[model samples]
Target: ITGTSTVGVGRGVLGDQKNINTTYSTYYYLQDNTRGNGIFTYDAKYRTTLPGSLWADADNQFFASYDAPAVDAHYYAGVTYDYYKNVHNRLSYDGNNAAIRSSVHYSQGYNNAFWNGSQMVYGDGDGQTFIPLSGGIDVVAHELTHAVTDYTAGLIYQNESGAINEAISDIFGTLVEFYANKNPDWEIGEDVYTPGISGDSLRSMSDPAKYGDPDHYSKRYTGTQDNGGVHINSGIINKAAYLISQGGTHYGVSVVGIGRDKLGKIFYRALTQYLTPTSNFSQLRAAAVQSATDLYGSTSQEVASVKQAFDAVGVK
Candidate 1:
């Protein structure tokens, strides 16, 4: 929809007040014209159909109970775009200022979110499993990072390559969460997971074993489930990333902390430059090491930490 760009106040799924970028064309549409081409949010209307409708509000004030998911989807997409542009120096998901689109309330009692090749899709979880996924900034960024991965590494979404893809998403997702400075932690999907229970998350990067995910490559799942354990085995890379950023020891292997920004630079360089479609764990270690050496010199602590992190995770 074409219209003058505007700002609207709203409460997200967590009842937090924030401003959303909207467009006014008779009715305020949840189409943010401020970022890239645009950040458009749609209502899925509890169906499988994509991008059901461009959300429209009569007063441009999105506070209704039904508007919670849309509010966060629109607002958080803007944040993800800003992070890419300012932090990563990349434009949108494709690095060409491509328009970002997202749909909320997808299907009935849906409990997942994903990047469907072209755009972001969020499920309004069955209230018990999750409330509204977009309410978690990490979840929103995690999905968007998949779009970036598709355009850059294009890592085949199965086996080791797929685990790398998933880990990349989680790595940047946690970075985007810390970038937003909103109760940042190394845990994924905590804000929107298991609302009935407190302090549990979908996965833990700092300690994957806390959630039954392997923290070492020696323990990686080889069975055929979850796309060759793409989600399950991602714990290996996630733990490596966590160690690279925050520093930790696992199985007597210790890594020196490099902080989040350096971790992001190293991985971003690897993803954009060295990684390939069929990159396996050993290949990923080489890519990350090369990335660190390029950015911070071969003798730099950054490069050493990248090696130690992967070694600690048994990637060698």
Candidate 2:
């Protein structure tokens, strides 16, 4: 909708109070035009729907309990957008200043979120397993990164290629979380995973085995479920990425940590420039090594760490 840009105060799903960008015509709407073309958030109202309705408030303030998910969904989308533009010089998910859209409260107790090819969808989780998934910035970034992968690598969503796609989302999701500097950790979905559990997450990048995921290639899952274990086998690549950013020893191999910035640069280059729809683990290793070489030179520690990290995770 056409309106003047305004700012609104709101509380997030986790009860964190923050300001959000809104648009004002007669009522305030959860539309941010500050970045790219625009960032619009909608309400699904606990139903199976796509972009149900543009969230509106009579006043330019959103503090009700029901507004929590919308606030976080909208705010986090903006943050994710800013991360791509400010860090990678990419305009939007398509690198064309595309209008980013998201819907929250997408079915009662839905317990999951996804980028459905064109837009983002979030579930208001069942109390036992999760809260609103948008409560986690990493979750929001993770879904948005899926759109990025769709537009860039066009990675096939099955077997090794699918696992690579999942791992890439987790990789950049962690990077975006760290970039926000909000109690960042190497754990995915930790913030909104379980209200009752502490120090547990949906997945652990630092130690995938902590959550029964394969941190080594020898342990890769070959089952047909989960799109050939796209989510499960992603652990191997996740561990490699974690090791590259923060060095660790795994299965008799040790890696020298090169920090997150270098890790992101190398991986981003690989994803955008080298990787393809059917690229598998071995191909990813070569891409990462070449990307690091391109950015920091073949003799640089960054390139060496990339090799050591993948080797430590048995990617070679």
Candidate 3:
């Protein structure tokens, strides 16, 4: 879409009305030129093929139908872009103004989403498990953060390194959700998980144990399944992050609240400057501690809270 940029109103998968970025050549196209290089949304057309085609509409309006996922994907990608740029000074996922692309309606009953080292891909759930995954802003931000991790730490997608990678995505995803102020919480995928169920999510940072995930290092899964429990063990780091931001006592240990601003600064610094591809849980503690020390002085309460949070989660 190379014509005039315009704003269009649309309804998402959840029936929420919002605005979408579109372009008008002859008809409105789901191409947003306002953020980064451009944010493009493609309809996967219930197949596994690469980005199926650019979604086009006769008019600039979208409603709660097949076009809903495309609308939300485009809108959420812009929101995530704004979050990274405004909060961390990151131009895009790659630190440069890279074009952000997303594909929705991938496969008939697909139940998940991924970054695939390049663009984002989402599935329309079986309707029992999930709705259109793009409906969740946190889920969108979580997958996009994987691309950010790829460009920065390049954390391996297995073992502790993998868990660290997953945790980093969850951390930023939650932050972006809060940045958007849409009923923010320390939970991931709450909006799009188990459509038939209520008051549950894919994971919980404040109490990962609530969902059978490890909130303590000792409880981490050591098996090879799920990429060495990348998703499971991430609970430990997520708990640490929650503790850092909103002081808590866990396993008889307590952490002082440091606020989300400092918490984000410390974690962002650690991710960009200290984390390695093979970094483990203990290594993350060091990176976060060092990051907090650098930002708030070695003797600052921020640094101490960082350490205490890690310790409370049994990271050290």
Candidate 4:
């Protein structure tokens, strides 16, 4: 509910967690609520500046002058926000008019950026091998998606669930990039670093094995890396979903692909509509197929292709 006529309050207290924020819901678009217009706009006013935040890493991928960091953060935030609204018809992180608060230049050359419980936090990349994580739309979307996962699936950050959680973020990251049509290409984080290291990133949706590893799923998926390599293994699922929805090939081989804007719709539907507190890959597959059938037709090719792609990705 995003409107001028809605207002309410809730207070919850746990020993370690407490919430007293008020709530309001309104339409994202000005007119035609029947068009399924649901967009939430979060407001956060933070300038990107921190003391001794320009230290370079061994790779030297992060470097931005005084004003450039803040400007880039704001620009990418806007792009991510608009993509969710225009493409998904969904409101902000909380499904309310929660203004997104962004804090840039956090800590001295911090190497990570994240969506804290309330606001988006950016670390001016160690300025060596990575740039400020918020300098691009995909990065912005990636962080925002962390918040979204917390809100939607409450995805457990361990084992396969953890991998799904991270993959979900990358899935939507690519979706936001595609929805924006800003870059047109499907590459992620192409703008976060300097030209020399621009292509380097934590994960790759098109090819997960680029990190000197196997590209497909393996039995030893859960290990002691990046939350059990959740972010790394996520490329497997992300590419599966992308190929499923994009109707293309993998490794230059022609595999059936499904070019459906409905990809996000179905996944969102499955994730939010049918997924449970601890749904895994098999259950996710079920929900997604059910979602596609429920949305299109029970006998639709979209549903069939989605299932096929899910299996192609080594889904059990």
Best candidate per lDDT, number?
1
Task: Return the lDDT, model 1, position 214.
Answer: 96
Query: In model 4, which runs have C-alpha deviations exceeding 4 angstroms?
Result: 1-64, 198-200, 212-214, 248-255
**1-316 per-residue lDDT for model 3 (tens digits):** 6889999999998898999889899989899999979999998899999788998888788984998889889999999999989989999989889999999999999999999877999999998889889999999999999999999999999999999999999999999999999989999999999988999999999999999999999888999899899999999999999999999898998889989988889999999999999999999999999999888899999999999999898888
**lDDT of prediction 4:** 0.61
lDDT of 1 by residue, 41-137 (tens): 9999999899799999999999898999999999988988999899989999999999999999999888999999988999999999899898999
* True-vs-predicted CA distance for residue 200, candidate 1, Å: 0.7
Q: Give the clash count for model 4.
A: 28
lDDT for each residue of candidate 4 in 28-130, tens digit (9 for 90 to 100): 2111122123212222223344222221122212122543454445445556666666776667666653565566667766777777677777777766756
Q: What is the C-alpha lDDT of each candidate?
A: 0.94, 0.93, 0.92, 0.61
Better of 2 and 3 by lDDT: 2
Candidate 2, 1-316: lDDT as tens digits: 9999989999999889999999999999999989999999999988887889999999978889999999999999999999999999999999999999999999889999999888999999998899999999999999999999999999999999999999999999999999999899999999998899888999999888998999899999999999999999999999999988889788888889999998889899999999999999999999999999999899999988888888887888
| Candidate 2 ranges beyond 4 A from true positions | none
Could you list the CA RMSD of all candidates, in the order they appear? 0.7, 0.8, 0.8, 11.2
